[PDB]
Every structure is written in structure tokens, then in C-alpha cells.
Amino acid sequence: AESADELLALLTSVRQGMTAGEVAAHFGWPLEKARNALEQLFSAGTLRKRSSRYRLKP
Amino acid sequence: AESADELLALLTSVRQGMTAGEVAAHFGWPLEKARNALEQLFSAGTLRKRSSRYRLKP
Amino acid sequence: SADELLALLTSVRQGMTAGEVAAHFGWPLEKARNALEQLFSAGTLRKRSSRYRLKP
Amino acid sequence: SADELLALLTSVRQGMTAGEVAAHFGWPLEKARNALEQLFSAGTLRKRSSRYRLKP
């Protein structure tokens, strides 16, 4: 019962937050195309974005 | 600039309503698999559904 | 023939679901769904497809 | 070498964005992003990827 689980993962992310990697994987798009889509909709005011954060490994 | 427009169509539908046909097209899935996904998530309480309605042509 | 179904749908201008049609005529659900889908494929009826949306 | 960057990140335990790093050191954004990505690829840093969400 993969498909219900894949759709639920997408729907949950739309609300909680999705990555370009996740969008690329669901749509079968290359990473740059997913990133562009998301960046354009962020610019357009459709999405909010939390920028990537880097921290020390333990 | 297709990809921003495709993503925006999906995101709009998640809120306003999506069809099995639309889900099949975005995910590259067969229709029956999209329908099953949506029906299972409707059963699970994740989604609401407006059933198909038929009316006379003019 | 679908004479009864079309007459019914002539009144209800917003349209009817297969379940509403099955209940009205006392037809099995499969029979209602197949009759409506047949009439849609023939161009007699228009169909608004089932839509699913997120709960708020 | 990334001696300054790692020292900075040693304090800020929740982590920093490339923009915050660029602002702190007065480095061009590309330089900040490349240095962090290099250190992430090397296994020195962990990275929480950018997430986008719908407006309510």
C-alpha cells in the first residue's frame, strides 16, 4: 500500500514543509527544476521558506 | 516556466480539491493507483471528498 | 432504456451522484454508476469528477 | 582553511544559514555557501535542508 503512503507524505509536507529533493522525487523532475519551481512560488508569495542551516556534527 | 505552474496547480488543488486524474498526471501513476491512494486517505480521515455529479447537457 | 433516469435528471438541474440515483430508483449502486457513465460517454450528460481536499 | 568558520559554529549550537555566515565574516554569499557545502560533504557539518510550506 505504497501509493497512499506516498500521497500522505506529500500532503503532510505541503503543510509542514517540503524540500526540493522531495518535490523532485514525487514529480520525477531533476533537482534544479524542483528548486526553481519552489523558489519561484516562494517569490510569488505562495510559499514560506526556512533556509538551510548547518551545524557541527557531534 | 512550466514547473512553477505545475507545482502551483498541485498546491492549489490540495486545498481546493483534486481529482484522481490530476493526481495520476502529477505523480506519473496509473489512474487506478491514484484513485486507490485518494480513497484510502479519504477513509483514513486525511481528505474530504465531493462525489462525482452528473447532469444534463444543454 | 434510460428514459426514467433522464426525466429525473431533467428536474434536478445541479445534477445527481450515482448514490442519489441508486437510492431514488432502488437500483444497485453498480447499475446506477454504469448507467450514468454510459450516458456521460454518449454525450447525454456532463460529469463533475470526484474531488478530494485536505481537511483544515 | 575553515578554522574560523568551525569555531563560530562551535558556539551557535542550533546552526547557521549561509547568509548568517556571510554576514558574520563579511564574505560573499557564494563563498559562504561553498565553504559550508564543502564541510557538509566532508562530514564535518550536518545540514537541515531548506523547506518550503504553504501559507495558511
Curated annotation (Swiss-Prot), chains A, B:
Residues 2-58 form the EutK-Ctail domain. It comes from the Bacteria. It is found in: Bacterial microcompartment. Monomeric in solution. Belongs to the bacterial microcompartments protein family. Probably a minor component of the bacterial microcompartment (BMC) shell dedicated to ethanolamine degradation. It might bind nucleic acids. This is Bacterial microcompartment shell protein EutK.
